[PDB]
Each structure stands twice: as C-alpha cells, then as structure tokens.
Amino acid sequence: SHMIGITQAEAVLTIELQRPERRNALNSQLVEELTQAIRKAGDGSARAIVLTGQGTAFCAGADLSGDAFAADYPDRLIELHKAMDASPMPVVGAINGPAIGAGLQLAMQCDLRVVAPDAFFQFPTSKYGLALDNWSIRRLSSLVGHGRARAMLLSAEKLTAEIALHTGMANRIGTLADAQAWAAEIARLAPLAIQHAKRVLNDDGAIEEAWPAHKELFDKAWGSQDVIEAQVARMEKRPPKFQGA
C-alpha cells in the first residue's frame, strides 16, 4: 500500500507519515516514499512543505520488523536526509508529538519547527548502547545549545516543548494548522532568497565526517554485547546490566 499521505492547499504541500500503528517509526518503505515525496514536491506550484505525523507521535524511531529490505534501511535513511538538505523548498516540521531517535533526526532536518505543546524530543541512545553520526550531534548542539546537548546525549534527557521553544529547537508552539498557516506566508516570500539562506545555514559545519577516533568508538558501540543486552533486557522486562563491552 502506502505509508504516507500527500496533499496540497494552494502553494503548501503537506506530507504526513501514516504508520501510526508503530507511532510512525521508520522502515525502508516509509523512508523511500518520503524521499520520493520530497524530490517531487516541486512538480506542482508548491513553494513550501509541511512534514507531520498521523496520530499522537511525530516519529518514535525505527522499526524494521518485518522489513524485507531492512539491510537497505540505513543507506536509504541517509538518502532521505540528502534529499531534504538539497530541496530548494523550505520544510516546516509540524512536530505533533514525540520525536525520538530517527524521529528526532528527521525533525532536525526540517528547516523550521512548529511543535505541539505535549511533544518532546529525545535520543535514548545511552539506554541502548548505540552511537550517533556526527551531524546528529552537531545539529542538536546548534538547536538546544551545547550544554543541553550533553545532557540529551550522555543521559537520555527528554527535551520538552516548552524548553524547545526557549532554545529555538521549536520556532513556535502550535498545531498542524498553525504550521500550515506559517508555511502559506513563507510560500509568498522570494524563493531564491530562501534557497541561498538554507544552503548557507546547512553548511555551518554540522555536516561532518566522523574523525578516526569517532569511527572507532562508533563501531565498538554498535558491535558490543551491551547492545544485545539492552534488547534482551527489554524483552525480559528487566533492567539491563551493562558491562562496557
């Protein structure tokens, strides 16, 4: 079938994630469809995009079961981010609920964010033994400030909507309709001005290749027994006993 919905009102294209049965957690199909929707957003008269989730969550992470193309997922995910980064259109994220893990990455790749009052943002990587790419860390630091980024990454701290507004992670607190109204205003602005500013802003240095030591630690985390222990402990409904290996 299809895992997203696409609609257009005048010059604003709204893309809605439609996998609420997994709180919009990503898989290969959802990512592929999103990539195509972004790439084709300029086929009509659209001048702005609103990206949002169906139901209570914006995107709760990733869920690859039972994804017949799960091995392709990580690469397709990178392709989606490249498509958003390269789009001449501004993407307004209507963050309607929790944005967690891959969902937080996706929210951060939007150009602007309108956040529902009860939404929150989180990287629970420290609870699962995983490591992030450098852009995720740099862009987060730019949006919440270095100090809060340390807490989010080292302790799995949740960022509330209210604090997101304080830091600028949220540009506004509001609803999907609020996001669509703002997008309508943006769609009336000069496209080449928007395109230039978006490119320069995205080229602030957040797009960064992992240093050699970063890659070493990244691979050590991903190949560790602790990653397995976090998964087993969850299935057995008990606290994980991590060993640092």
Place this chain on the structure above:
Amino acid sequence: SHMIGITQAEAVLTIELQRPERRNALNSQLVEELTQAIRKAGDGSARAIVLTGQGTAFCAGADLSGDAFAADYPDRLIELHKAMDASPMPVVGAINGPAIGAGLQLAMQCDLRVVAPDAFFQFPTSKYGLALDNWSIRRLSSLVGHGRARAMLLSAEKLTAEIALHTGMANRIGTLADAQAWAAEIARLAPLAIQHAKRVLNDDGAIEEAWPAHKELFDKAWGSQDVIEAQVARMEKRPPKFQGA
C-alpha cells in the same frame, strides 16, 4: 554637512548616527564618517565607544538616494566592518530602536549591546529577494541561536528586545544613558585583556568566505527578476508575485 555626532565624557566616546530623516539608513557619506570616527576614537583618552542612533531607530537599513557615490557603498560598508573588527576599543551598541538589514549587521559588529525595550532586529531579505554574506548569517546564528536564525532568515521573523535578552543578542535592556554608564565601567578595565578577548571572539569562525555554491546562489538572487518585482510591487503598493527567477 555631517551625518554623525561625536562627543566624549571622560573615557567614553559616543558616536551618534544623525540621519533620522531616513531612520538612520546608511549611505556612502554616513559610512565613511562612521569609519573615520571609529579609526580616530583612540586619538584622545577614550577607552570605550558607545554607538547609537538619533531618534526612534538605531538603523533601518540602507538608502542610497540620491547618493553620488552609491556605487562605492558596498565596499565602504565592508571597510567600516573591518574598522570596527580591528579597533582595540570595545564598542557598546546602544540599540535605541529598530535595527534592520544593514542596521542589524552594524548592531552585530558592536562588541556588546544594550537594547531599548521597544527595539527589534530583522533581516527582511526574504521579502526582497536578496542574499546575505556568510558572516551576517554566522554571527546571527551565534547571537540568537541556530534555530531562531533559521526563522529570521527564511521567514523575515522579527526578534524582539525581550527575546534578544533571552538569547544574548541583547546583553542588557536599557537606554543610551545605561549604555554610557556600562561603558564607563568597561573603560576602567585592563585594555590589553579586552583586546585579546575581542580578537579571539571575533575569530570564532563567523568571518567566512562564501563557498562556491553560496556565491552561485548569492549572484542568482541579486541578479533575479524577483529583486526587481519586490521593488516595483512596493512602489505600486501591492503584494509581490515572485517567480523564483
């Protein structure tokens, strides 16, 4: 005549923009006079500068009509910024009212900012089809946070004095007299300490040459029909109809 006023009380030199008939919008003469005032600020016993505007605005942008040396304006403007950056003296901006476009650039080149309660900051570039230099974008991101910088640049969002205080764009809310009092305290501090910190702070990376793609998009914006359309639409008192070309 002259488009600025210069006065000194003890060790504080106050420079006032005096083109209130255009809300202190810059031209070649005003820029040249400001550059000279900054360069000569150390001829006396001055240890701090206060920069401010006459009337309701700090600086509402640029107005080159009918400037006999308008072709020279962009280069002279860069020279002014170089002079402020190179000055061993700390410049306290008493931002007495709106700082818009070139006025926001000028405010950001000050070392510290004391902002009047009703002042605001804005880059309305997206309403006019124009593109900014990279420093304007980087220094703005550092002062308001990356998230708010995206909104200011992509949607022409105004930054209020209250929010400026929250982000650190405003170091204090207050008046010209308040700025002059603080400058007096600063003038009693150790000059070589101030000089070192100013140089290192300004060398945070904001002074950045445009990347090749940035230059391409910058020139595309400036040479576009949309830039003309914004001007014509204003003269005809109607909404612009931008085409992205």
Place this chain on the structure above:
Amino acid sequence: SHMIGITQAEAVLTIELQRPERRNALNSQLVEELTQAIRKAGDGSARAIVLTGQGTAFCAGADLSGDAFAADYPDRLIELHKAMDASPMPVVGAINGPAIGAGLQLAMQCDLRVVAPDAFFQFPTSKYGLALDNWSIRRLSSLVGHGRARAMLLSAEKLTAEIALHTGMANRIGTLADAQAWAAEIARLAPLAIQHAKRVLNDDGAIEEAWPAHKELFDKAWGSQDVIEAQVARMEKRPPKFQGA
C-alpha cells in the same frame, strides 16, 4: 597531607576539593592529586564521577603561595584537563558555590553540571589584565551563548545560577546529593554510548590552538605593567590605573 577527599557509593565516585581555607583555589598539589584521582577513577567498579568543592565555593581560582612547585602549575593544570577530557567516565560537576577563573575552567571541563542556587560563574580576567587560552573562550561561548560570553570576557560579568540554567551551563539547579542521584542513574547507562558521545562533543572545535595574533596579544597581556598594577592596587586597596601597556 592531602587536599582532596575521595569516596564511593556503589558505582559513583565522588571527588571533593578540600582546600576551603583558600575557597578551593588551585595549586600544584591540588591539581596533581585531582589528576591522579581522575586517572584512577576506573580502578574500581565506578561508572560515573561527581566533582565538587568543600565549603562555600566550588573553586575560586588559583593561589600559588607558598607553592614550592608553582613554576610547574600551569603545565600540571593542562595535564588535569587532558585527564578529564580523556576519561571514559562522565564527570558530573556539583558546582556548590562560586566557580571563578581556573574554577570556571574546571567546571566547564566537567561533562554535566548541577549548580547550587547561590553559585555563580566568572572570568575576572579583564580586572587583572590577563588573557585566556582559546578553549576557555570557545567552551564558554558554547555553554552561555556567544553574546553572554562577550560580556563575561570583556566586562567580567558574573553568570548567576538562574541564568546558567537558562543557557544550559547548568543542566540542573540542585545540591551535591542531587548530583549524586543523577550520577547514579547515569552509571546504569551503556558506557560505550557515553564514551562515544563525550569524545564527539569534546571534539566540537573548542580544543583550538591559538592563532598567531592570539598568541601575540596573549603574551603582550601577560608581560604587561598593567598585570603588575592590578596586583599592587589590590594590595594597596585602591582602584587600578591601567595604561594599556
């Protein structure tokens, strides 16, 4: 004797500065002992460190009298920072009171900060004619925002606990016990995830070699008569009369 105390409750190691007779101001001995404590923190079962000061101050700066190894102090201080940066353990600073000069540097080298309501942070370098290393300036800018960093460095502005919470310099307002409770939660998280994120965060660019002009100005400040004048004026209980030389 010893100038620090070291205790462990389960998986949290608490290191306490114990020179309250100088408000925990550093010297060669205190720095050496701290370095050893950090290096050996992983000899037991510890997974997190809490760093704190005895009495009313976290660390009020440096006091090298009468330190028989004072000439070694600057190098040993750098060694301490290297040890904290290299530690696989997250260091939670329980900033129990003022963190000034070397004390602010030490607080900033912690991975997370829990700050007492009456604590404050300050670099009074401008009152003493001194210059800082580039990391101190970059890490401060990342924690309080560029705008407040300008005020702290150019005017010796104090950062209150409340404003520290706003900017993310403080992750939480609270007590030593509060810090120890949070550290206990962190000690249950996956160590390799924490290690990766800490390394990437610390490699944001704050660790920066002084540019040639920065070194020139740094040496000019440190060798100036104004540095001597600040010290003499203090001893004579009068305002300093700085000359910029």
